[PDB]
Design a protein around this ligand. Structure first.
Ligand SMILES: [Ca+2]
Ligand SMILES: [Ca+2]
Lengths: 485, 485
């Protein structure tokens, strides 16, 4: 294939994430023939290691992904290490050499990517020094991959953005987002813009309401520590839900270039309504899971590392409003939670029921277009048809499709996609500042009410699909959740 | 259920069709609880028979449809016979008595249906005498069921219509049509008008071309005699194909009453273009099957009762044009033949490919909505989506649905539906004079050229889907047959 000439530097190269997902993902790119000769991978972290040790660690990383050990070895040849502390300005000069050495060794003309697989606290610092100690390629591109999370509020995120903008331009910042880089999520645009019947129907005239669902069966388990101060709101809503919504609510772009796609999404985000106390109580529902029908389904407050006085949300459901002509009056329902009926990630576009009366006992109903993202990719379409009865009558039928085993094999894992995207400079599947900022502004307004405790905290049974209030949220507009569990 | 009070008279009651399909269909209506007490069935034909003989014949008819002999017997009690010759005006007075007797015996206030399961030659006569010898109910309704065919040309059909109109009004004439009374064909309206995304897309703006296919695997077998002078053109095209097209090309009715539905269909039929010699050669293809890859797949000319000099068509494919704003420039391709790939009856609505460019190697393609009528009812929808590849690209995926075993059981057979329709007075699933006349005018113009032999007769391999010219017919508008075999 067309070879990719790039030099990647992994800050936090000794970390679990690197050897657990990053390195294997980069290996696949080698196997697929993308990375061939003109490329290098410079690992870095505080822990001192001689090349042999690092290369072995990499060897352990790509173990289960190896078939021909010789091919793997030829790959490992492209790795190098350098002990380094991120707070030491002078210490950076060591790294500059490592990078410029590897560059020479394989004749790589710039094209540098810096993957910060380190704690949030070091993002701004590392960025600042890459610029100061002339680590940025004087030719070719320079791109930065910011691991999650990007801020914990609007202000912290704005701060982070400021620090990064002192060394990079926004179109060079590639923020990691799991669900945005998922095969099915990218289908949305194709379904919509690729089929005129849907494209022309993507608006208020045909759509009754849109639904996004991020359901998880598991509970908090051990993530209690950080989860207790983040909850579903920041963990699932602010990032995954919000960006998926972006693909759905976007206008029709002038073309499919990441630039036009982004401008299109932003048009929507800029129209999103930010709520006040009263509105958050009306359009949103915050809940925490209680006990299930068994003992092992312990209430949230009985989970390890969870404070008894906690009023943290293990579930969030709310209505989004877009002040755009296209979505005038079209509700966007979102929900994400733990200890729910089943692991499911899906989007349900509910179309308005036709007004043509057949005189049947059962008149026309609402058609539903459904995109199943997790676990198995699927696309369903509930249509109106004639029931098999003596008298003329209508009913709904489900037209369905599922990914094949072949599609299931050739599908690239998230990290490999994101990393590969960055190498090509494809920001299409990435959140930009405008989107991230709005998402934060939006969530910030909600968090305010929750921290202040000026909103009730519902409770629900472990195994259900949430609190009753969730269903009542939609019933208020005469709607209902398509996915029932 | 709401009991049906009716009195049916079967002309040609001793015929194969009556005891083979008619009577069982009427039995089912009894089993389903529609016909209960106030109903009677008067059989009639030349062959003299005493009640016992007739009732036994009926008993033999509904044999394989009986479970509880006692229930069947209670039904047979409602039958009566009367020997009769249709050309004898006086002989009709005998029948008037039989009818008025049965009416009294079960207290049936009019509501008479006269099923002419006799040769075409007797249709006008029987009709004339039903009026003359006061056989028509002085109260309640009077309906007539005309078995196939309704004329063999426009003129013969107009003649028939005239004779019948001397005794009945058009809305009382229920012409039998197999494919029109098929479960799947009735779904069309539901799919279209029940789902706004399709309703609003049912026109030139979204549709590229429409395709109707009546494929049969079998050859002529023994039907050679009458088939040689009828061919596919009159056998499948003029009646089945033409009326199905009607459901597809109709405008949007003011309501779903048979009246409005009919006016809607007529608006289309009145816009259909009738061809001349040149046009028939351009927009239509006439063919006859040759040999297959085996001996038992004998050429049409080697079939029993087929004249060696025959230039009869065992296959017909053509383009229909509707001079209506809604179908301006939208081709309607129709095809029907014998010795083709497989038994199939389907409708393919091909939508225009979107013009939104993704920059992918494979840009958007044409979406296809498919309604499978025979054998197993199914509905498929080929949509545009994203292919599972590293680079962004589009592909087509098939969303599908199939009738369930339950839907397959509860589905009423054609004759039972038609007969039951007539009892309720539901002309929705019936062709009217305007439709029949236009279909005939349309086919007549074609037959003219064929009889005159001013059009070529193509040949094709038994087992294929027709002659090459068929594919070339569509290629000319940049189209292709969806069903490939
Ligand atoms: Ca509301
Ligand atoms: Ca043409």
């Amino acid at each position: 294939v067309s070879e990719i000439k790039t030099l990647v530097t992994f800050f936090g190269g000794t970390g679990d994430l690197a050897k657990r997902k990053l390195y294997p993902s980069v290996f696949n790119l080698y196997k697929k023939g993308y990375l061939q000769k003109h490329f290098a991978i410079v690992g870095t972290a505080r822990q001192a290691l001689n090349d042999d040790e690092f290369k072995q660690l990499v060897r352990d990383s790509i173990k289960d992904f190896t078939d021909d050990q010789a091919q793997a070895e030829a790959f490992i040849e492209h790795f190098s290490y350098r002990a380094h502390d991120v707070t030491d300005a002078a210490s950076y000069a060591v790294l500059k050499e490592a990078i410029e050495e590897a560059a020479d060794k394989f004749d790589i003309d710039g094209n540098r990517i810096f993957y910060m697989s380190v704690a949030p606290r070091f993002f701004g610092t590392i960025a600042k020094y890459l610029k100061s100690e002339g680590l940025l390629a004087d030719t070719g591109y320079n791109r930065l991959m910011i691991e999650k999370p990007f801020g914990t509020s609007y202000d912290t995120a704005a701060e982070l953005q400021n620090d990064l903008e002192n060394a990079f331009d926004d179109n060079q910042l590639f923020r990691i987002n799991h669900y945005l880089g998922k095969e099915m999520v990218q289908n949305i645009a194709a379904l919509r813009f690729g089929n005129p019947i849907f494209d022309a129907a993507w608006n208020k005239d045909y759509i009754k309401n849109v639904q996004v669902t991020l359901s998880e069966v598991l509970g908090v388990e051990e993530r209690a520590g950080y989860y207790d101060t983040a909850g579903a709101l920041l963990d699932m809503i602010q990032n995954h839900t919000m960006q998926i919504v972006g693909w759905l609510a976007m206008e029709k772009p002038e073309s499919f270039t990441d630039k036009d796609i982004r401008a299109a999404k932003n048009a929507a985000f800029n129209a999103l309504k930010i709520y006040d106390e009263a509105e958050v109580n009306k359009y949103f529902v915050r809940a925490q899971y209680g006990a299930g029908d068994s003992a092992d389904f312990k209430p949230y407050l009985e989970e390890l590392d969870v404070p008894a006085d906690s009023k943290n949300n293990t579930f969030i459901a709310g209505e989004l409003q877009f002040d755009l002509p296209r979505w005038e009056g079209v509700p966007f329902y979102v929900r994400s939670g733990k200890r729910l009926a089943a692991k499911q990630t899906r989007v349900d576009i509910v179309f308005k029921a036709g007004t043509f009366n057949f005189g049947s006992e059962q008149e026309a109903q609402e058609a539903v277009l459904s995109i199943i993202i997790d676990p198995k990719g699927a696309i369903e379409l509930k249509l109106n048809a004639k029931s098999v009865e003596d008298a003329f009558n209508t009913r709904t039928i489900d037209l369905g499709w599922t990914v094949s085993d072949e599609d299931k094999k050739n599908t690239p894992e998230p990290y490999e996609r994101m990393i590969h995207d960055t190498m090509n400079g494809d920001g299409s599947n990435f959140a930009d500042w405008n989107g991230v900022s709005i998402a934060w502004k939006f969530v910030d307004a909600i968090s305010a009410v929750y921290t202040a405790d000026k909103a009730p905290l519902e409770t629900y049974k472990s195994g259900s699909m949430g609190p009753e209030a969730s269903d009542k949220l939609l019933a208020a507009n005469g709607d209902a959740w398509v996915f029932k569990g």
